[PDB]
Design an enzyme around this catalytic site. Structure first.
Site, PDB file in Angstrom:
ATOM      1  N   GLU A 216      68.179  12.414  97.215  1.00 14.32           N
ATOM      2  CA  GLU A 216      67.735  12.373  95.798  1.00 14.32           C
ATOM      3  C   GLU A 216      66.817  13.310  96.341  1.00 14.32           C
ATOM      4  O   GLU A 216      66.883  13.845  97.642  1.00 14.32           O
ATOM      5  CB  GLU A 216      67.021  11.705  95.673  1.00 14.32           C
ATOM      6  CG  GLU A 216      66.653  10.189  96.755  1.00 14.32           C
ATOM      7  CD  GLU A 216      66.438   9.020  95.811  1.00 14.32           C
ATOM      8  OE1 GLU A 216      65.382   9.093  95.087  1.00 14.32           O
ATOM      9  OE2 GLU A 216      66.807   8.009  96.409  1.00 14.32           O
ATOM     10  N   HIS A 254      48.926  17.781 105.542  1.00 14.97           N
ATOM     11  CA  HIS A 254      50.035  19.050 106.318  1.00 14.97           C
ATOM     12  C   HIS A 254      50.429  18.981 107.299  1.00 14.97           C
ATOM     13  O   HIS A 254      51.511  19.297 107.282  1.00 14.97           O
ATOM     14  CB  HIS A 254      48.497  20.481 106.368  1.00 14.97           C
ATOM     15  CG  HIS A 254      47.880  21.339 105.598  1.00 14.97           C
ATOM     16  ND1 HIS A 254      47.298  22.148 106.064  1.00 14.97           N
ATOM     17  CD2 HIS A 254      48.397  21.128 104.372  1.00 14.97           C
ATOM     18  CE1 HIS A 254      46.252  22.163 103.929  1.00 14.97           C
ATOM     19  NE2 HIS A 254      47.442  21.555 103.427  1.00 14.97           N
TER      20      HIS A 254
HETATM   21  N1  LIG Z   1      28.975  24.177 109.368  1.00 23.88           N
HETATM   22  C1  LIG Z   1      29.473  23.984 108.788  1.00 23.88           C
HETATM   23  N2  LIG Z   1      30.894  24.226 108.174  1.00 23.88           N
HETATM   24  C2  LIG Z   1      31.723  23.477 107.412  1.00 23.88           C
HETATM   25  C3  LIG Z   1      30.929  21.779 107.810  1.00 23.88           C
HETATM   26  N3  LIG Z   1      32.348  21.502 106.352  1.00 23.88           N
HETATM   27  C4  LIG Z   1      33.491  21.885 106.432  1.00 23.88           C
HETATM   28  N4  LIG Z   1      32.739  23.501 107.037  1.00 23.88           N
HETATM   29  C5  LIG Z   1      33.523  25.192 107.044  1.00 23.88           C
HETATM   30  O1  LIG Z   1      34.386  24.892 105.462  1.00 23.88           O
HETATM   31  C6  LIG Z   1      35.965  24.770 104.880  1.00 23.88           C
HETATM   32  C7  LIG Z   1      35.927  24.147 104.318  1.00 23.88           C
HETATM   33  O2  LIG Z   1      37.461  23.196 105.095  1.00 23.88           O
HETATM   34  P1  LIG Z   1      38.146  21.700 104.585  1.00 23.88           P
HETATM   35  O3  LIG Z   1      36.999  21.370 103.351  1.00 23.88           O
HETATM   36  O4  LIG Z   1      37.921  20.614 105.803  1.00 23.88           O
HETATM   37  O5  LIG Z   1      39.420  22.134 104.129  1.00 23.88           O
HETATM   38  P2  LIG Z   1      40.181  22.514 103.642  1.00 23.88           P
HETATM   39  O6  LIG Z   1      39.645  24.036 102.827  1.00 23.88           O
HETATM   40  O7  LIG Z   1      40.292  22.015 102.322  1.00 23.88           O
HETATM   41  C8  LIG Z   1      42.224  23.039 104.099  1.00 23.88           C
HETATM   42  P3  LIG Z   1      43.244  21.334 104.747  1.00 23.88           P
HETATM   43  O8  LIG Z   1      43.148  20.625 103.356  1.00 23.88           O
HETATM   44  O9  LIG Z   1      43.818  21.889 105.362  1.00 23.88           O
HETATM   45  O10 LIG Z   1      41.756  21.051 105.647  1.00 23.88           O
HETATM   46  C9  LIG Z   1      35.555  24.146 107.204  1.00 23.88           C
HETATM   47  O11 LIG Z   1      37.337  24.646 107.480  1.00 23.88           O
HETATM   48  C10 LIG Z   1      35.146  24.994 107.815  1.00 23.88           C
HETATM   49  O12 LIG Z   1      34.734  26.539 108.382  1.00 23.88           O
HETATM   50  C11 LIG Z   1      30.099  21.721 108.228  1.00 23.88           C
HETATM   51  O13 LIG Z   1      29.585  20.636 108.154  1.00 23.88           O
HETATM   52  N5  LIG Z   1      29.515  22.980 108.611  1.00 23.88           N
END
Ligand SMILES: Nc1nc2c(ncn2[C@@H]2O[C@H](COP(=O)(O)OP(=O)(O)CP(=O)(O)O)[C@@H](O)[C@H]2O)c(=O)[nH]1
Ligand SMILES: [Mg+2]
Lengths: 296, 393
Positions: A216, A254
């Protein structure tokens, strides 16, 4: 190595079985079915009930106690999930050649720890958990599979699915081929027996002339089975292999992707497996494959 | 089982894992009330969906991102209004998307470096394994396929546990240099210990970040929990919202019935997930579309056969019910009386095709045929399927 215990998968009429969780609700029912089917059930175990009698058989407190009294060589487990892992360990400690764990719902962490020790020994062979068991039609039935649909024959069946296995069995009997040995490896990610383990026994069993593999979607078990057949089954003594993969019409973190039916079907075919697209044509497909090769 | 980000984040902090201070809001104006409640130098807006890939996902309103960053609480209420209530269609959601009912406003931190780290039970690795990459943040699967050499694995011995040499090596391969190596290695240990404590099948942190002040922080967390361990994870499984599942799914679970809804009209009642899929597979083969399958599991009780009919019939989309029970632990004649009793007690409209092949089937079929009820018995799986597509004319 643990592969040395592969041999203990092929139970026969001389296999003496004990039931862990004997007086339990499940153990009673399936122990009766085992006795009526002719299986050499020689007792069981339930903590705190040693000495009593159950289904005309002795009850013991521990597996090792039951083993030295009855000379049992196989054990079936119906203990609930919270204590089923420890029940497997009790059988390995007692060096029971074959252990079949039917219980569903064992925490994966428990089985990771169980399999950690299991792979470091070669005296005990585990089937399951979360599996229907193993049955040598007419000789030995260790599990929950309905016995009446089986008939000693020529097709070795290995299935990662539960009740779906019975369809391949019933069909192979209606077409007159029957089954040499049927093994349900269960639907848990961490188990004691995989596809390749059973395919090894089938390819070396004279009584097994054809093979049916029930799979499956999910994981890569079917892919690994394909690679195994590609190298070991391609040859003069190649045995016909049929398969059905459930979930062809099923809809789709992932880490798992870092380390899919279509890929399975194509992989099994590359190894020479004839994949039936219908779950009701496992018997007819293997039957005609026997006809193609003048095996009837 | 999977929890939201704001639920996993709490579990991590309680066990010594460094995470961001956060608050959850159900409305857009309340997200502004919470953004101000943080007292933060900056505020991060993160849509709450159990799926991954929020960064480059688009809503049904035009907002191009399930994650936004702003410095003024007034912008959160504007962006929050473009998140709450909308479907967030990302790389790992259905093409229709998933409705976003909650959003996360957290004390945003600066990210000097993004790395990937995951702990999970893997069959091939025979137990737990640390999976990490220095090329973290956003698409990890892209770099995993392009450059496999940038993926580092550390198999952990379940008995010995995570050793210092392993945490230090992984932390070094992730690019944590100087005093941050021992700090990251200490977070990796506390993550693995948490991984085992909560009976998780996967703990994924992406990005496993590194702030400019020298603090190793888990910015996003995706924890997958072992369903089999619920009996010893009561507090955690109580946190499961269940709102992202269809109401009938939660209703079937009440009676130990797992439900999987589909886009069809032939409901399926089967014992065994593998057989249920095979039942659906053979229905397509004969032109039918299964409305769903209600997996019964090995444990059969005549109370849930009564309920099973109730839930399937509750959905008006069900134009037929296919019962396929093969090899149950209970006598078929007992299931036969539960089917009739349920039919008699519920006034069934949809046609009912029943296939029973377990123990003592001859009597069971007699109980059904000599009941005077709209029941046509089936012999094999192919027969039940062909008889199910015929009853939808
Ligand atoms: N400066 C800052 N940037 C942030 C913060 N949180 C997220 N980011 C940015 O936004 C992006 C959003 O990624 P995230 O939501 O964690 O994951 P995703 O885009 O769903 C991909 P995956 O599912 O593999 O994690 C991060 O990779 C980073 O570049 C934060 O608290 N501060
Ligand atoms: Mg993330």
């Amino acid at each position: 190595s643990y592969t040395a215990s592969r041999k203990h998968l092929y139970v026969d009429k001389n296999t003496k079985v004990i039931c862990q969780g004997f007086t339990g609700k499940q153990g009673t029912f399936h122990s009766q079915q085992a006795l009526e089917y002719g299986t050499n059930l020689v007792g069981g175990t339930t903590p705190g009930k040693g000495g009593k009698t159950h289904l005309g058989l002795p009850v013991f407190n521990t597996v090792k106690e039951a083993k030295e009294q009855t000379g049992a060589t196989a054990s079936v487990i119906y203990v609930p999930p919270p204590f089923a892992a420890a029940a497997i360990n009790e059988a390995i400690d007692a060096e029971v050649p074959l252990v079949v764990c039917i219980t569903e719902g064992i925490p994966q962490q428990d089985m990771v720890r169980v399999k950690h020790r299991l792979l470091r020994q070669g005296k005990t062979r585990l089937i399951g958990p979360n599996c229907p068991g193993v049955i040598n039609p007419g000789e030995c039935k260790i599990g929950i599979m309905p016995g009446h649909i089986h008939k000693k024959g020529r097709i070795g069946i290995v299935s990662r699915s539960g009740t779906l296995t019975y369809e391949a069995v019933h069909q192979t009997t209606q077409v007159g081929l029957g089954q040499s040995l049927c093994v349900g490896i269960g639907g848990d990610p961490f188990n004691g027996t995989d596809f390749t383990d059973c395919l090894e026994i089938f390819l070396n069993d004279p009584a097994t002339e054809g093979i049916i593999l029930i799979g499956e979607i999910g994981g890569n078990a079917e892919e690994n089975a394909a690679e195994f057949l590609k190298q070991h089954n391609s040859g003069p003594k190649s045995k016909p292999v049929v398969s059905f993969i459930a979930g062809l019409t099923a809809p789709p973190g992932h880490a798992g992707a870092i380390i899919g039916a279509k890929e399975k079907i194509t992989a099994l075919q590359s190894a020479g497996v004839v994949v039936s697209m219908s779950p009701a044509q496992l018997g007819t497909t293997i039957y005609k494959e026997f006809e193609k090769r003048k095996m009837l | 089982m999977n929890l939201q980000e704001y639920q996993s984040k709490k579990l991590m902090s309680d066990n010594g894992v460094k995470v961001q201070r956060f608050f959850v809001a159900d409305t857009a104006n309340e997200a502004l009330e919470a953004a101000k409640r943080l007292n933060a130098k900056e505020i991060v807006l993160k849509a709450q969906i159990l799926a991954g890939g929020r960064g480059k996902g688009v809503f049904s309103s035009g907002l191009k991102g399930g994650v936004h960053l702003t410095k003024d609480p007034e912008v959160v209420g504007q962006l929050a209004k473009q998140m709450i209530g909308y479907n967030l269609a990302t790389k790992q959601t259905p093409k229709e998307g998933v409705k976003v009912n909650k959003v996360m406003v957290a004390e945003a931190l600066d990210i000097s470096r993004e790395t990937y780290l995951a702990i999970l039970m893997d069959r091939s690795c025979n137990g737990p394994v640390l999976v990490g990459s220095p090329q973290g943040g956003v698409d990890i699967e892209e770099v995993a396929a392009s450059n496999p050499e940038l993926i580092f694995k550390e198999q952990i011995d379940i008995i010995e546990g995570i050793k210092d040499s392993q945490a230090q090596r992984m932390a070094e391969n992730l690019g944590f240099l100087g005093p941050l190596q021992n700090q990251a290695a200490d977070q990796i240990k506390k993550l693995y210990n948490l991984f085992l404590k909560i009976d998780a099948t996967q703990v994924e942190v992406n990005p496993f970040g590194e702030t400019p002040e020298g603090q190793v922080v888990c910015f996003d967390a995706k924890i997958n929990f072992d369903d089999n361990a619920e009996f010893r994870q009561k507090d955690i499984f109580a946190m499961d919202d269940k709102s992202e599942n269809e109401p009938i799914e939660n209703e079937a679970a009440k009676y130990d019935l797992k439900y999987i809804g589909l886009d069809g009209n032939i409901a399926c009642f089967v014992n065994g997930a593998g057989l249920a899929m095979a039942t659906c597979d053979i229905i397509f083969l004969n032109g039918g579309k299964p409305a769903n399958f209600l997996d019964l599991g090995g444990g059969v009780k005549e109370s849930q056969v009564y309920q099973a009919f109730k839930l399937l019939t509750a959905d008006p989309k069900v134009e037929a019910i296919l019962v396929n029970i093969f090899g149950g632990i209970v006598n078929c004649a007992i299931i036969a009386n539960g089917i009739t009793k349920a039919c008699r007690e519920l006034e069934l409209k949809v046609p009912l095709v029943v296939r029973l092949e377990g123990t003592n089937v001859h009597e069971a079929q007699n109980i059904l045929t000599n009941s005077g009820l709209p029941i046509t018995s089936a012999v094999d799986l192919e027969d039940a399927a062909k008889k199910a597509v015929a009853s939808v004319t």
